[PDB]
């Protein structure tokens, strides 16, 4: 499983954990991504309209699934089916965000443009 956990109580909602698979996919070592917002995976061909939907889902604390282009450390592109989910503690208070990444062009690109 490719996934990261971020802490929205810390400035700029930084990564506090990244799985081994996520590091292999993105070509980053854990030390150079901890404490950073996961936006470093976006690049020139990333649809900003899709990024806007992630921004709203984090604001409203809703789960969302989108497909978008991301970049590995060396600049290699990959399609990312991205599922974001809020994690709440026993008191029903927002505690973490978990983002799961599935690499592949699952939804055909010409259908996604609609
Ligand atoms: C847990 C978590 C995982 C995320 N994973 C990705 C990702 O894999 N790819 C991506 O493009 N954005 C991902 N994001 C979204 C960015 O981190 C960021 O929230 C988005 O770009 C909007 O924020 P910004 O406008 O300040 O950059 C993730 C966000 C969270 C909270």
Author numbering: 389 to 502
The publication says:
Phototropins are higher plant blue-light photoreceptors which regulate the response to excessive- or low-light levels, leading to, for instance, phototropism or chloro­plast movement, through two distinct light, oxygen or voltage-sensing (LOV) domains, LOV1 and LOV2. LOV domains, which belong to the larger Per–Arnt–Sim (PAS) family of small-molecule binding receptors, non-covalently bind the blue-light absorbing chromophore flavin mononucleotide (FMN). Under blue-light illumination, a covalent bond is formed between FMN and a nearby cysteine residue within microseconds, constituting a photoadduct. The formation of the photoadduct is associated with structural changes in the LOV1 and LOV2 domains, most notably the unfolding of the C-terminal helix of LOV2, Jα, which leads to the activation of a serine/threonine kinase domain.
Unexpectedly, we observed that, after a time corresponding to twice the relaxation time constant, the space group of the crystals changed from P43212 to P212121, suggesting that the in crystallo relaxation of the photoadduct population leads to a phase transition. In addition to this expected result, we observed an unanticipated phase transition, which occurs 70 to 80 s after the release of the PS equilibrium. This phase transition consists of the loss of a crystal symmetry element, which corresponds to the transition of the asymmetric unit from a monomer in the tetragonal space group P43212 to a dimer in the orthorhombic space group P212121. The non-crystallographic dimer is obtained from a crystallographic dimer whose molecules have slid apart. After the phase transition, the continuation of the ordering of the C-termini develops asymmetrically into distinct conformations and at different rates. While monomer A continues to fold in the α-helical conformation, which is completed within 130 s, monomer B refolds at a slower rate into a very different, hook-shaped conformation, which appears to be fully completed only after 1620 s. The difference in C-terminus conformation is coupled to the orientation of the side chain of a nearby bulky residue, W467, which rotates by ∼90° in order to accommodate the hook-shaped conformation of the C-terminus. Most importantly, we observe that residue W467, which belongs to a well conserved FWN sequence of residues found in LOV domains, acts as a gate discriminating between the two conformations of the C-terminus. The loss of this salt bridge may drive the sliding motion associated with the phase transition. In brief, we observed the appearance of a symmetry-breaking phenomenon during the in crystallo relaxation of the LOV2 photoadduct.
